[PDB]
Ligand binder design. Sequence first.
Ligand code: UXX
Ligand code: UXX
Ligand code: UXX
Ligand code: UXX
Lengths: 261, 261, 261, 261
Amino acid sequence: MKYMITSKGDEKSDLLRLNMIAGFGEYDMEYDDVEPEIVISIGGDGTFLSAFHQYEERLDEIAFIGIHTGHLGFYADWRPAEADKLVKLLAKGEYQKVSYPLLKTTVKYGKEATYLALNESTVKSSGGPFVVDVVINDIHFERFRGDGLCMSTPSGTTAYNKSLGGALMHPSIEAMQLTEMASINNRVYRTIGSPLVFPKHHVVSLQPVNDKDFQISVDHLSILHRDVQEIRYEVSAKKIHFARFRSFPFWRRVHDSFIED
Amino acid sequence: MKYMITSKGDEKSDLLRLNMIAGFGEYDMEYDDVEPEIVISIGGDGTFLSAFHQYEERLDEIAFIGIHTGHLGFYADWRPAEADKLVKLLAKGEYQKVSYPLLKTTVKYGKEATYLALNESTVKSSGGPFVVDVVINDIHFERFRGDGLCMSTPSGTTAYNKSLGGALMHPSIEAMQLTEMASINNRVYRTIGSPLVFPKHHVVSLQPVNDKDFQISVDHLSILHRDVQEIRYEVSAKKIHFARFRSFPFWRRVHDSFIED
Amino acid sequence: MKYMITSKGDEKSDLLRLNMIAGFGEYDMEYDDVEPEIVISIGGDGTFLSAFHQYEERLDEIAFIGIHTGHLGFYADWRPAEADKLVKLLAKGEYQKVSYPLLKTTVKYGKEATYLALNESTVKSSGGPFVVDVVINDIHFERFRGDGLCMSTPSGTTAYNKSLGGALMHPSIEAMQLTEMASINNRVYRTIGSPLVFPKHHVVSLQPVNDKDFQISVDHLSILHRDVQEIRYEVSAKKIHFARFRSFPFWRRVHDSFIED
Amino acid sequence: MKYMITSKGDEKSDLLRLNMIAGFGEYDMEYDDVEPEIVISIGGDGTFLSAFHQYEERLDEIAFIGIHTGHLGFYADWRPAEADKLVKLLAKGEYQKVSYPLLKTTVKYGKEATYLALNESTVKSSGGPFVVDVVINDIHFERFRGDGLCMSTPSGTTAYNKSLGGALMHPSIEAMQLTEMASINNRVYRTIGSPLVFPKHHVVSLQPVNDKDFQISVDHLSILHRDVQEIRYEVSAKKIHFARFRSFPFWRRVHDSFIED
Ligand SMILES: C#CCCCN(CC#Cc1nc2c(N)ncnc2n1[C@@H]1O[C@H](CNC(=O)NCC)[C@@H](O)[C@H]1O)C[C@H]1O[C@@H](n2cnc3c(N)ncnc32)[C@H](O)[C@@H]1O
Ligand SMILES: C#CCCCN(CC#Cc1nc2c(N)ncnc2n1[C@@H]1O[C@H](CNC(=O)NCC)[C@@H](O)[C@H]1O)C[C@H]1O[C@@H](n2cnc3c(N)ncnc32)[C@H](O)[C@@H]1O
Ligand SMILES: C#CCCCN(CC#Cc1nc2c(N)ncnc2n1[C@@H]1O[C@H](CNC(=O)NCC)[C@@H](O)[C@H]1O)C[C@H]1O[C@@H](n2cnc3c(N)ncnc32)[C@H](O)[C@@H]1O
Ligand SMILES: C#CCCCN(CC#Cc1nc2c(N)ncnc2n1[C@@H]1O[C@H](CNC(=O)NCC)[C@@H](O)[C@H]1O)C[C@H]1O[C@@H](n2cnc3c(N)ncnc32)[C@H](O)[C@@H]1O
């Protein structure tokens, strides 16, 4: 019943938001942006990402929906001309919910900060060279030296992960995927090169070697952390829920976005 | 109780086999290569692969063990000097079993042949250009034109898959991964490029466009199929079982094989 | 004055050929397919490649021209609607000539065969594993184990070379470029991975390690060589000459073929 | 006759410098760090890079020599134990000189700054997304959106260029090579992907689309430029000269650094 709508803030998106609010006024639907059950995002994937983070403390109580006013988004995958048909079906309800895994990032100091990502979490150096020891379930795997690392959710595999050579994986797979950014590899320095796909309950830990200052990005929020002792990655126990009103399979979403629509 | 041992057939491996048979003679163990419960492979990964295919019709009744007489194998991951300690622990039994997913390939004609793979199944043209339509769960995904395609199990991701840019994935993930071989991409021709990771119950189907003759390889068995109507890939319902006597984690096996041992 | 025209042999291309012959009949131009000075290819890049090889023994006496009846070719880069304007300017003559480097392949036995390539020369195994020692100017560089190797001219860098990760290089650079096909890289096996760009007068030599039978392709002619002692690559001293009637820069040809036309 | 020596500043390198100065005292050699003819760098490639930039205004009057106190450098390719044999041969002189191409970067504002690079020049965004139009000899080639671009000299192709997928090219080739950093490629955005190798006299120009602030790195000097109108790349007319006392071929240097020494 409760719902809210975020807008990219351009003219196209604000007006669509006002028309859907007016349309919702004709049903037993209450606009509440403090404890919504339905969160509608109008813009692009960036706008959907912002809506996710705005409500990340009530993920289990919310079903998300993305409307793309521009080109197709991987998250905002319904067209504005569908808005009225969307208002109807939401109002009635009785829709199915679809869940995607999320990535948990923990940053320890010398204290602890955790973040939830829908696309990916990346780490780079704050200026100096990036050198980190990569530990998988407490086993020292490799010493990474290069530009940085990117740890992706399944639904993020079509975003930054894709541009770094990562594999695309179906979002029903509870996993995370680590890809390299420009690693150095010579007689002295050696990384695996290949992307790595980790299952639930595996912990990947980055440990500093020299500099302890890192720029850490969660989705498109980039934050400089100082005095870093460890960055820990693992598939979250939390999941994001999408209201789904029709079949739009992931691989078809992939075909439409990258091959031809 | 029943068991058998395959050997690479060189002097090192035959002698180790004879010594383990002699060692087994000192326990309630019967050498039976028709209905073994324990299959021991002595050689390299190729030798383990051959042992897998020799007994693929009794996978649920067999626990496999690989001994590497040469360099570390991903499947033959115990050292010859461990043979006597291996005979002991097998004899007693009471070991844990570890299962890895397998890949099912179906080839249809104008009749049907199916194959089980532990590493991967690849398709190439019998001489002409390789052009196939790639259909994912009955959705036309792309038209692939190039050298060929490779579909990998999780434990195969460190084999051919790795050399083609595929991601490495932990074998506890019930999935298969498709990688391209030298795809052409220009104004007229368009593939996804990225590896694709499919979950259980997804069906990837290759459909010929012009030539219907393909060289299909399952592990390192390469067979020319004529008059091909479809090649269908999916995670098998069958699994391979390994007798495990100690912890040797996959990511540590990966580190030892590729980073440094 | 002397000239000839090859055709892809479909209806579109044969008719264009007949109309250009008729058009040439109106000038001091003689159709001679034994000692042409102007060779016109009507079809696609494959048709231009065949025309190149048909006359590779008179490369210094011939200027080539490609007309693409289908999509833009990198070699057949003029449109059929330009045919009449082409006949005119050829007839008069006084056009500029443009030269592209070529690749020389030498195959030695236990005797010698040499081949000239306009796109590339590739080597693969005749069935077994491909293992070759790579020697650069008599220095042992690496042992390559994998699917095969591809050695490209500059103008071939947009063809097979491109699909294997090679760099695109401007054809005014007298060089050749070696790219890997699916090399194995682990503790035991080590290749450079990166494409290699060699200047004029450098000799790259492939030397067999075990099997001496290789499938060698020059452009799209694939030939099984038995009892191979060495394959030697070097930039040819010979060059292919194009009649050029207007500016169509390589990088613009690249943009039109791969980015958008 | 005039010469100077730079040191990494650790104990190993300072002492080697003092011993070579003492050794030079026994010949007609004058220590002059204002107008040297011979510049000796003792440290690693970073130390050689700093020596290059210290004297980039007298490149035509200087022959450089690199001594590596740590692992082999691509520029500092002589061993400390060779120092005394080095002092001798320098003193006499009569050595051959070897020249490598350099990269010229021009940055225009709304004024002009130029820089010379021995390894590469890279461009990234000052925080926002990196979006630049890539113009080759005044032809609009592509719109690049992603992490950044890297433009490499031939001798830089084994440095950052290598980690980004670039080809390795022999330094006798007067060229520069452009590689992408994590480009986005989907229905809306399209780059060539492949590295590009440009000959002498080609001009690659980056032109801003939205944000005009870029972090530009020349070798390992990273500088934030504001109010940028254009970045222009081209092979320099200037060259760096190495004193060479024996054969150490580039491809052997490549083998030693990456394959095995
Ligand atoms: C800048 C800016 C404003 C947009 C912020 N943006 C929103 C998004 C998204 C998003 N999620 C997915 C997805 N799950 N599946 C497929 N498409 C997806 N997209 C698409 O990415 C584009 C927007 N991103 C950029 O232009 N990035 C700068 C190169 C649009 O086409 C979206 O539809 C943040 C995300 O940027 C991704 N990103 C960052 N650097 C990247 C790079 N070098 N290459 C590719 N992606 C990169 C990263 O993952 C991050 O979370
Ligand atoms: C030839 C020959 C004789 C050996 C047959 N061989 C056995 C195996 C294996 C195997 N399984 C795995 C694994 N799960 N994890 C990591 N290592 C693994 N290996 C290792 O591969 C090497 C042997 N293969 C080759 O030399 N291939 C020719 C280039 C050895 O080091 C093994 O320890 C078959 C397998 O070959 C793989 N293969 C084929 N073409 C490849 C290529 N171009 N690059 C890389 N691998 C390739 C493919 O996957 C196939 O099933
Ligand atoms: C099959 C068939 C019939 C065509 C024969 N064909 C002619 C050509 C050409 C050619 N030269 C260039 C060039 N200099 N610049 C850019 N485009 C170019 N093309 C284009 O390639 C396409 C035709 N090739 C294929 O379809 N190959 C099978 C995948 C067409 O679009 C041409 O316009 C031979 C050439 O095939 C190339 N080839 C082979 N295997 C490849 C692969 N896996 N990926 C990419 N290219 C491959 C190789 O280099 C060879 O010489
Ligand atoms: C940091 C730091 C201090 C060193 C500064 N350093 C000096 C150099 C060099 C150099 N020139 C060459 C060459 N022509 N041929 C082959 N080896 C070469 N190296 C080697 O690079 C290593 C040092 N660089 C780094 O560790 N970079 C951070 C990842 C050492 O092994 C050198 O022997 C600057 C150069 O860094 C290169 N660089 C930057 N980011 C890179 C990346 N992500 N991957 C690979 N290289 C990168 C870039 O090109 C720049 O000019």
